[PDB]
Amino acid sequence: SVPSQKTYQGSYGFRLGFLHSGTAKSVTCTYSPALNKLFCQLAKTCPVQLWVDSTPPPGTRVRAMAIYKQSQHMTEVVRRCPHHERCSDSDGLAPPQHLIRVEGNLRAEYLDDRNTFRHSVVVPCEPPEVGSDCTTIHYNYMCYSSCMGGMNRRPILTIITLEDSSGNLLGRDSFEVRVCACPGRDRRTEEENLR
């Protein structure tokens, strides 16, 4: 089984947004619109904006899940490598096997799917606060793209789904992720390679 990655704004006009962080050597998280790709350091804050055209119903949730991008690896569950899953970096909520965490949200729930065995993290969809036009979720990625026995240099996609209270699909967006030591440099390199 492979989760859909089809972009779907749905009834509420759901889509993601990203900050403009640049590509300086000091940057820890940066998004490339040209590549639709987030570059980030291990376990560092990744702000992801949620934008809607109209407010979805109370009980709407936002789920994140990783899959492998490449055709020949899409059926394999994305998980932390044998090193990082045994790290003592628990936050009290995320299972140690999960690549994607939500930072600083006590209502985050982590799912180990009983059928597909895939991991995901889900939070309530909060409306924007006063003085803001969007809401932001802070994600952390807990293994490097290069980790042996884990992602093993294989690119991943994060799929963000807007769901109703039963888990039915309301909206979908996605982006590639590279977890790496030098996200600014790697973004510059990959944007050059594309050009």
Ligand SMILES: *c1ncc(Cl)c(C(=O)O)n1
């Ligand atoms: C995971 N958790 C803790 C530590 Cl100290 C390490 C490491 O070997 O750097 N990994």
Ligand SMILES: [Zn+2]
């Ligand atoms: Zn790892």
